[PDB]
Design a binder for these strands. Structure first.
Ligand code: XG4
Ligand code: MG
Ligand code: MG
Length: 430
DNA sequence: ATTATGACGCT
DNA sequence: AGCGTCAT
């Protein structure tokens, strides 16, 4: 009733760059613009593995995780850009620097949470309060929302997509009570006005296009962002949640796409997020644990409390390389050489991080995978990181992993190593 | 032989 | 601290 909190206290947006690495390469090379194109890492095995796909190429069925050779079967005119290689491995520096460009623009409008190389959450609650005081009860013109979809509208009592977008927006705006400065729907609308401005600034100052979601929490903002990619933003109101979730497969919600979501489906005998509402909070906790149960009980009603963290910089800086099948490292000299290449990249990135961001990592995490282990990491060991020196970190990494070598022979390495991973963590202000 | 990361929960 | 899960 009057006391049931509805999770409508915040305005949260999620901004995600469209086919980000592709856009970075299309900015640099105009010949790739407005074409089916993809970004690949490496080349010799099956043409390289695709990690980003322009929307024109997606129309042909090209996807992330495809081998380029297979993608070319679906799209013979597909254009390809390769990730830079340095010290024998993929080097993603160009895309990290482009990411910093975007995140610095977003930070002008609000404190952001860097959630990946291409996306950030924004808590717009206070900015919305401010813009509402400025508006002085003045209604919001559809011209301020030129790329916004309102999820669930139009409804009730008309052929092309832009016309449908405008019909839905008109219905939404006419239903608005622009007098109540505390109306959650009005707050979301003003948030969407601000996100239009943020996306305009990103495109004007970088050339990059993005999509966004606007809702009352992070999960709904992320889901909304996906609904109308590319180059559009979507508002998911609290009221839109029952219909949206009534046919939403459980796996589409962030964090339910793996074993937990499968167990929700299997234990409860349900398929859609909306079906979760029929269970009590205690029932869900009994199946999925305290925290998961409370999270599911709230989230199927559109309510989620995870805060937008004030964090524009990544928490860790890491370097990793797989050595699949027959390229796996089987000698001590090989393991040392690749530990050194990874450590040299790490030292470069860490030194630049220290100069830019006034902090120093203090812990070095070494992870390996051995042949025949189906897990990501076969072993993880930490040691101290006291100097940004690649020879030192690579010698320390060897010292912490050398006991994994089954070979009594000192020259060989058995079982051979199919992955090396160095990660700098536990940053302190310097 | 999907790869290269990054986040975060569990014990 | 080291491992597992999720993500893409
Ligand atoms: N190295 C590496 N990079 C990856 C991987 N997967 C993605 N990336 C990189 C390449 C991606 O460009 C970037 C951002 O990932 P998204 O937001 O998930 N995809 P995008 O922005 O391309 O398309 P959309 O319009 O649907 O958002 O992360 C991977 O497995 N490995
Ligand atoms: Mg993206
Ligand atoms: Mg993303």
């Amino acid at each position: 009733g009057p006391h049931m909190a509805t999770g409508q206290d915040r305005v949260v947006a999620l901004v995600d760059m469209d086919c980000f690495f592709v856009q970075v390469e299309q900015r640099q090379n105009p010949h790739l613009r407005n074409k089916p194109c993809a970004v690949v890492q490496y080349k010799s095995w099956k043409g390289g593995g695709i990690i980003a796909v322009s929307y024109e190429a997606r129309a042909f069925g090209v996807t992330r995780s495809m081998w380029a050779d297979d993608a070319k079967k679906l799209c013979p005119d597909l254009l390809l850009a390769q990730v830079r290689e340095s010290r024998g491995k993929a080097n993603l520096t160009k895309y990290r620097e482009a990411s910093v460009e975007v995140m610095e623009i977003m930070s002008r409008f609000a404190v952001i949470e860097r959630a990946s190389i291409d996306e950030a959450y924004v808590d717009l609650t206070s900015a919305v309060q401010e813009r509402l005081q400025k508006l002085q009860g003045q209604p919001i013109s559809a011209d301020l929302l030129p790329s916004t979809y309102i999820e669930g509208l139009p409804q009730g009592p008309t052929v092309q997509k832009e016309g449908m977008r405008k019909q839905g927006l008109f219905q939404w705006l006419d239903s608005l009570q622009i007098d109540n400065l505390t109306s959650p729907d009005l707050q979301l609308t003003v948030g969407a006005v601000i996100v239009e401005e943020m996306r305009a600034a990103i495109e004007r100052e970088t050339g990059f296009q993005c999509s966004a979601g606007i809702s009352h929490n992070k999960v709904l903002a992320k889901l909304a962002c996906g609904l109308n990619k590319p180059n559009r933003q979507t508002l998911v109101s609290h009221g839109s949640v029952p219909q949206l979730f009534s046919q939403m497969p459980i796996r589409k919600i962030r964090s339910l796409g793996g074993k937990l979501g499968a167990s929700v489906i299997e234990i409860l005998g349900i398929e859609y997020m909306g079906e979760l509402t029929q269970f009590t909070e205690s029932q869900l906790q009994s199946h999925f644990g305290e925290k998961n149960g409370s999270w599911l009980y709230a989230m199927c009603r559109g309510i989620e409390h995870d805060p937008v963290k004030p964090r524009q910089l990544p928490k860790t800086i890491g370097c990793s390389k797989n050595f699949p099948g027959k390229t796996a490292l089987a000698t001590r000299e090989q393991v040392q050489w690749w530990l050194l290449q990874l450590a040299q990249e790490l030292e470069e990135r860490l030194t630049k991080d220290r100069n830019d961001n006034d902090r120093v990592a203090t812990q070095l995490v070494v992870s390996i995978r051995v042949q025949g282990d189906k897990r990501l990491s076969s072993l993880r060991r930490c040691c101290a990181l006291t100097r940004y020196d690649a020879h030192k970190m690579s010698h320390d990494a060897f010292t912490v992993i050398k006991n994994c070598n089954t070979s009594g022979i000192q020259t060989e390495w058995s079982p051979p190593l199919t992955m090396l991973f160095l990660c700098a963590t536990k940053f302190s202000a310097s």
